[PDB]
Structures are given as structure tokens and as C-alpha cells.
Amino acid sequence: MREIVHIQAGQCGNQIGAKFWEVISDEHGIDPTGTYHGDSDLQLDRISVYYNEATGGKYVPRAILVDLEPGTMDSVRSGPFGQIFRPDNFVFGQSGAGNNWAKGHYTEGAELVDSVLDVVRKEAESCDCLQGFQLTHSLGGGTGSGMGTLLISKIREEYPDRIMNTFSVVPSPKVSDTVVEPYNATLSVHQLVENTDETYCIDNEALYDICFRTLKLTTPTYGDLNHLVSATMSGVTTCLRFPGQLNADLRKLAVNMVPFPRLHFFMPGFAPLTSRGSQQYRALTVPELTQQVFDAKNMMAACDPRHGRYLTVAAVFRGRMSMKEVDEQMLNVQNKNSSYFVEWIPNNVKTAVCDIPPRGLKMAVTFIGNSTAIQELFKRISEQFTAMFRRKAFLHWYTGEGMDEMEFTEAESNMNDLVSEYQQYQ
């Protein structure tokens, strides 16, 4: 039944997911224990994609919850929806990655990697025929990158023919919260290119501007910065869980939007995004939503869509609509803004319509556009990398865990070649 198994590697990944499993449950009527209390039967027709029915009339999350420290686990258990998780899944050490890449990739997680890898093989057999690997992590610390890159290259050994979904928050120049953020990127460039099929790129920078301005809100906490990413990841997986007129599931999106073996970095998008005040001053319809979708200030990756082209956008509509109204709005924008799209690919839009909206609206959407403006986000990290390596600064925390000079020379050429492909085909 096209199942999806879920890994969360790192504190941000363990907190994006802890609300992602909160938002995905009230779609399906899951109580805080694990039983069904929903209303529509269309929930239970495909409930078995994120769930295993355990006996007694209960359900469990197919989720494998990875840290190297017990501190984040305690927040997971004692927080919202802790009890629903299966207590065999919490595979975690006691040491700590220390915000080192090589400690989560050569030293500490490297002797816990198999004890992760056999809770997923148990979850690989509660399913009829799986397809989904949701990995939620960072590019900021140790458990996000080094524990979240060795782990993908092990799942590729078992499954050379599934689809991989990273959800990778990126480092920004404005909000730079640690000191070695440029070292937790270029090392993880090397194996999120050639071993993942899609890679959503979310930033901490642009995700505050949505909270101050578009939502008109004064206190952006992380439980709101996550709670936007939760409602994007609750949107791409809608065709696996609900019927719709023009349906498009996870491979069907990923075959239309990815024209090349490497250019598969996406940015999300979500509409409506209104305050508690500007509710009554808005009238929900397809031109209401589609114009907000294509805004320059509704891209969570902190880049300007005006500074580049899109190659292949796609929108995933939800709610009872009419097709021509959705067809003509997508017809409108390729006519209106034909300079901002690629000239050698016709019909850039792949519509997807689901008959079920998010809970308690009239409609909603989810935007994903494989733009060219991603070429700027890596230059904001490639030049932060360029200074710190040129002095060979901070090199003694990495040579002391097994790394080498050679691992830093080749990794720049990998991030060199990536921006060398958006620009060559823009």
C-alpha cells in the first residue's frame, strides 16, 4: 500500500517531526493514545502508510527516532504524542556529536549505525510494499549531517530502487547560530547529490519573514517555524492518503519535476498565509490562492525568485475546486510572467488536485518549484567556507576524529559543480 517509513536524525529533525506527527494525526483522527477517533472513512482507506495497527484497536507511528544524546529524547517522550511512539524505536547513544561532523560519522554513530539499521528492517516488514523514506534533519550540527549522511548510503545498499526524501534546513548568513556552519555543509554536499532523489531546502532566514509580516505575528518560536514545515510535508503526501480528481503521488511528482540526474533541489510553498485579523478581508478561491503561491515573499529557501527562472514548478491543490479555474490560473502565469520561466521547456506546471483539503478550510495548496535561484544559496555558504579553510582554521577538531586534508579539497569541487549546473542551464 505504498508505505512510507520515517527517520529523524538530530534535534531539529527530532522537533520538526514531533509536530509533523502532531499535524498528521488530526488529519486521521488519532487520539493521544493511538486509537482511531476520526470522522471520515477516507482516513482509514490508506491509514496503513504511516501506521501499523497494533492489536487492541491501536495504531503506531512507523518512525525511527535517532539522536546521540538522551536529552532530545526526553522532550520527545514527555512532550506531545510521546506515548504513541513505539519504545523499541529510540536508538540513541549517550556521548554526543559535539557539533562535529566526524564524531557523528566516524566515531560515535558509526558504532550505533547498525542498531539504527535493524529497527528499520523490522519496520520494512510491517509493510506490504514500501516506497517512502522521510529523513528529517539539519545541515547545522553533528547528528543532522554526519549521522544523516552515512545513514542514507546504508539504505542505498538495501534499496537501490526506492525514493529518498530529505528535508534539509540550510545555513543562512543572517541567522548563523553556530561557528562551524560552513563546515557542516560542504562535507554533506557530497552525498545529498548522488544518493537522494529529492531534497527540500528550507532556511531559517526566510522562515522568520513569513512569521513577522505575512502572518503579522510578533513572536516566531520554533514551534511555529516547524509548524509551517509540518504543513508542507503533510501536503506532498496527500495522494497517498486521500483520493482526488487529478492525482499525483510521490514518484509521480518526482518524475515530472526532475529533468536531470542531479538537479533535484526544491523549495516549498504554502497558501493561504494570513493573520488572525486579515481573515475577513479575503475571499478564498483559486485566483486568491494561486497569486499568493507565486509571490517572491513566499519561498522558504531564502532567495529571490526574481533573480532567476523556474525550471519546473508544480502545485498540489487541495479542496473541492473546478479544473478549468485551476487550469486557467496556471495558464495565466506562464502567459503573464513568461520571462521568469525557462524558454526550452514548455508547460512548466504539473497540477495536482486532491478532493480532500486540509482540515477545516475551504481549500489550500502546496507549491514546489525547482528554480534556478538556488545557485545563490550555496554561494552564501561557499564563501563562508572559503575564508575558514584558507587559514586551515578549526582543523584540529576534525583531524583528531579521523578526517584528512583530502576530504576538504574534493568536497569543494562537488559544491562547485552543483552551482555549475543551474547556471549552465538557466
Binding site: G98, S176, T178, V179, Q384, A387, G400
Partner: protein, 430 residues
Amino acid sequence: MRECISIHVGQAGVQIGNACWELYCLEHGIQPDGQMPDSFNTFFSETGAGKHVPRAVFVDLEPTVIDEVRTGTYRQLFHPEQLITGKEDAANNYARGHYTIGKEIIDLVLDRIRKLADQCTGLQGFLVFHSFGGGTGSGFTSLLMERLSVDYGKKSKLEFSIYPAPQVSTAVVEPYNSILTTHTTLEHSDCAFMVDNEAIYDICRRNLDIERPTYTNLNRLISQIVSSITASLRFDGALNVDLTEFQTNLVPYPRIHFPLATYAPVISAEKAYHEQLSVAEITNACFEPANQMVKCDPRHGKYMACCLLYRGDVVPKDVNAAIATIKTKRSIQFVDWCPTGFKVGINYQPPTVVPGGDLAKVQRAVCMLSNTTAIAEAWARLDHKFDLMYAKRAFVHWYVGEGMEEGEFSEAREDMAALEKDYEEVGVDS
């Protein structure tokens, strides 16, 4: 897990720790007997029932001050295996405290540590408190950190040394204690501190506004600096900075490991009602020259990497807004090739202060620990004070018969000479 040990070598180290353990028993709800009428596994170990003992091995070579602990209110938390007592001290001599007298009793402290070290499984690090002007904490520790480093491999070690001022200094041969302790500063401790006696006396009368600053108020302020590194082990938070996470952000090079602390809000008892002590202010308070624990100005020396460690009612949105303003500043300048120099942790607890203390009950706090380039000019104040006493060969005759020789004195000068020279090398851009 996550446990670490305290060693209080010297009269400086004990009386600092005499309030550092006053503070922690206050924090966790622990009466001085050991009773707690969760968190405390960083410094404690619960034994039996209703008893908590610390990781407190107090080492001394003279029985005066330790007997005060054994008759003070904190005699019951500690148990009489712990308190190593000597007979007759170094008395501000090196080669007594290292080569001669401490050779007797240092076997008694190591086999007291390992009956306390192999009881915890979550060994984090060491907190060796001493000075650079004692005779106990001067060169006896230079023997002791060449014992635990042989035993414990590459574990983290943190020394918190009191450092001599140019003007206010209360001994004579203090330009001889500091040059010889450098060989166990670059080699047997990976996060080595400097705190001045001068620079805190300016704070007790201008920020706290008290006319008589003595040692029991010079030191209660250092207890709050130690209590903020360990808010991330002992407590949770939105962002947490573990004590091995701390050093990888902070320390940029294999030998430069000299941060300097500071703290805010250091304000008076009745100046609180009017000051609007906000997140944009107390972050801005960490860059005034009148909030330095070391007598040096933050302006003539450029920063390299600070590590903001907050505590209290702080959300992370405005820490970005407070650090946005400080990056727009032009006099607060960084070395250019470290384009981000910011690391932020947050505790959820309120920072607390001692009843009968001198500080004000606030609801936010910040403890910056910056690595910078200005503090190498807090060494030329003391290389000069050494430069003339050996020039006339003064005070040599107390060391020759006690073990110390001449040829190391010319040799331990390059131990400091290259060390000032290397901040000149990595402070300049290109």
C-alpha cells in the same frame, strides 16, 4: 551520565570553591548536610538515602584554611576522606611545591580521585581552581596536571586561574610564579582562564556600587560564571551547549585556548527598578570596557569568536535581533576570516543569586566567553615585571637548593615569548 570533577588546589582555589559549592547547593534545593528535601549528576552522587556528596577533592599544603571548611557550615556535605591536608606549604616557592613537598602527598590525591572518578560513567571533565601567584596553586598543579593527563588520555580539562594585575598585587615573587606555570598551560589544559583581581574591583563599585570590595564579593561573582557553563548539562533548554560542544565552537586553533569571561546583568540592588534590562541591553552590556574580568579593553584588540550563553526568559528571535545590531557596529570588529563568530545557548531556568549576596534578582542573564586578541597585552604587563628581577638575578637562591635550576628560567621565557608572538601572527589579516 554527564558528570565532572572539581579540584581546588590553593588558597585561591578553595575560597573560590567555598562559594562555588555554596551556590550549587542553593540551586538544586540541597541543604548543607547533603539532604535534598533529576539534574545533579554533573557534580554529585547520591549515596544511601537522603545524602548527596560532591565531586570535591580539596587539596592544600597547609592546614589553616581547610580546617575552616571542616568547622564551617559545609563540613557536613563533605566527608573527611575528601579533604587532603598537608603540613607545611610551599610558602610561595615553586621548587618546594613541585619538586620537594608535594611529592609526598600527590600519591594521596590521585588514589582519592580514582575512588571518585570510577564511580561515574559519564565523565565530562575537570575543574581545577588555582591562582598564578600562590605557592600551592602555582607549581604543584603543574605536577598535578601532568598526572591526570597521563591517566585520562584526551579528556577535557578546565583550569580557572586568578591572574596578577599590574597595579594591585599583594605578593613579591608573583612575576616568578606565572612564568613557570605556562608549561602546564599550553600542554595540560585545553581551556585556560585568566581573571584579574584589579578588574573586578572596578565592577563592585561602579556596576554594583559597593565601597568595600573584599574577597568574599570578588569571588561570589566568579561562582556565577562557573554556574553558567554547566547550565546545559544540569538543565535543558531551547538551544543547549554541551561542554564538548563548547570548545569546538570556541577554540579555533590547537594552542590558542585563552577565553575571558564577562557577565550581565551586573547591576546594583536598587538600580534594577529603573533600568530596562532587556535582551538588547544585556547583550549590549557585554561589550563595554567596564565589564571585563581582565584588565584590558575590548577595543584595541580584535575579537575572534565569542559564545553567548544565556539563561532565563529568552526567546531566540531577538537574540538574532540583538546580534544584528552588534554586527552593524564598527568599533566592535572581528578577524575577517571567521565570518560568523556567534554561538547561542539558552537555559530555561531563572539565574539565581545567594541570599545575603550583593547582586540583584533578575530574570535574564548572559555569560559571554570571548576568545580575542587583546589579552596578549595582559601579558606584557607581567613580562616586564619579570624582565628586571631576573636581570639582577634576584630571589634565585631560594630555588637552587630546592630543585629548580637556572637554565629553565631562560627557557621558560620563550614559553611566553612565542605565545605573545602568535596572537600577532593570527591577529593580522591579509
